[PDB]
Amino acid sequence: NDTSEVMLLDTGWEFSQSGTEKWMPATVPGTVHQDLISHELLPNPFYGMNEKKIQWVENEDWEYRTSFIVSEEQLNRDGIQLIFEGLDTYADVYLNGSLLLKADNMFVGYTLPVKSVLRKGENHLYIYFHSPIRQTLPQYASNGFNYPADNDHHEKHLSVFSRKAPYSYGWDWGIRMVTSGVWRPVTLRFYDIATISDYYVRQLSLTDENARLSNELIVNQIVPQKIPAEVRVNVSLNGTTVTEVKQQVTLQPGINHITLPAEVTNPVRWMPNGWGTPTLYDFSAQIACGDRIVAEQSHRIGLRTIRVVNEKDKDGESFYFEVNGIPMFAKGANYIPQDALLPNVTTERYQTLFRDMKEANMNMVRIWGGGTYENNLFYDLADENGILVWQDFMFACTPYPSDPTFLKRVEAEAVYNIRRLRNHASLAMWCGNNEILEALKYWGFEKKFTPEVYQGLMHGYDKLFRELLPSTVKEFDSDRFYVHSSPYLANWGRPESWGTGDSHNWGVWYGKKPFESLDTDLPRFMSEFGFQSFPEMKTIAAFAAPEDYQIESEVMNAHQKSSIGNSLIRTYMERDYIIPESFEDFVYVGLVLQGQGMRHGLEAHRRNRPYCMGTLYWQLNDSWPVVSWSSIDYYGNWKALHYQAKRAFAPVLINPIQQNDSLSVYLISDRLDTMEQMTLEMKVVDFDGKTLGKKIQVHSLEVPANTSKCVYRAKLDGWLTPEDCRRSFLKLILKDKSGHQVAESVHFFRKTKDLQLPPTSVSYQMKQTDGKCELTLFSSMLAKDIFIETPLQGARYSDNFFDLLPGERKKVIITSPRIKLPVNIKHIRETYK
Ligand SMILES: OC[C@H]1C[C@@H]2[C@@H](O)[C@@H](O)[C@@]1(O)CN2Cc1ccccc1
Ligand SMILES: [Br-]
Ligand SMILES: [Br-]
Ligand SMILES: [Br-]
Ligand SMILES: [Br-]
Ligand SMILES: [Cl-]
Ligand SMILES: [Cl-]
Contact present, 656 and 630 (Cβ < 8 Å) = no
CB contact set of 594 (below 8 Å; sequence gap of 6+):
531, 532, 533, 639, 640, 641
**Cβ atoms < 10 Å from Cβ of 723:** 9
Q: How far apart are CA 407 and CA 472, in angstroms?
A: 12
Nearest CA among 43, 165, 189, 175 for reference residue 106:
165
Q: How far apart are CA 543 and CA 559, in angstroms?
A: 9
Q: How far apart are CA 638 and CA 801, in angstroms?
A: 10
Nearest CA among 68, 100, 99, 104 for reference residue 86:
104
What is the 80 CA–ligand 4 centroid distance (Å)?
22
Q: How far apart are CA 470 and CA 467, in angstroms?
A: 6
Nearest CA among 738, 749, 746 for reference residue 682:
746
For residue 172 and ligand 1, the question of a CB distance below 6 A is answered with yes
For residue 171 and ligand 1, the question of a CB distance below 6 A is answered with yes
Q: Which helix (H) or strand (E) holds 261?
A: strand 254-265
Nearest CA among 634, 615, 607, 426 for reference residue 504:
615
Q: How far apart are CA 322 and CA 25, in angstroms?
A: 52
For residue 730 and ligand 1, the question of a CB distance below 6 A is answered with no
CB-hemisphere CA count at 13 Å for 310? 17
Among 157, 172, 627, the mutation site with the greatest number of ligand 1 atoms within 8 A of its Cβ is 172
For residue 618 and ligand 1, the question of a CB distance below 6 A is answered with yes
User: Is 698 in a helix, a strand, or coil?
Assistant: strand
Q: Which spans in 207-295 are helix H?
A: none
Atom of ligand 1 at shortest distance to CA of 396?
A: 9
What domains can be seen in the chain, in order of their start residue? 1-192 (2.60.120.260), 193-302 (2.60.40.10), 303-649 (3.20.20.80), 650-751 (2.60.40.10), 752-833 (2.60.40.10)
For residue 502 and ligand 1, the question of a CB distance below 6 A is answered with no
Q: Is the dihedral angle over the CA atoms 434, 350, 279, 357 positive or is it negative? A: negative
For residue 42 and ligand 1, the question of a CB distance below 6 A is answered with no
CB contact set of 387 (below 8 Å; sequence gap of 6+):
272, 273, 332, 354, 357, 358, 362, 363, 364, 365, 381, 426
Q: How far apart are CA 714 and CA 662, in angstroms?
A: 6
What resolution in angstrom units was achieved for this structure?
A: 2.3
Intra-chain end-to-end CA distance of the chain, in Å:
69
Q: Which helix (H) or strand (E) holds 220?
A: strand 210-221
Atom of ligand 1 at shortest distance to CA of 172?
A: 11
Q: Is the dihedral angle over the CA atoms 150, 395, 159, 618 positive or is it negative? A: positive
For every residue of 506-539, DSSP letters joined together read: TTTTTT---GGGGGTS--SSEEE-B--BPPPHHH
CB-hemisphere CA count at 13 Å for 603? 24
Atom of ligand 1 at shortest distance to CA of 562?
A: 1
For every residue of 1-30, DSSP letters joined together read: --S-EEEE--SS-EEEETTS---EE--SS-
Question: φ, ψ for residue 291 (rounded to 5)?
Answer: -80, -20
Return the CA Rg of the chain.
29
Nearest CA among 649, 662, 677 for reference residue 734:
677
For residue 435 and ligand 1, the question of a CB distance below 6 A is answered with yes
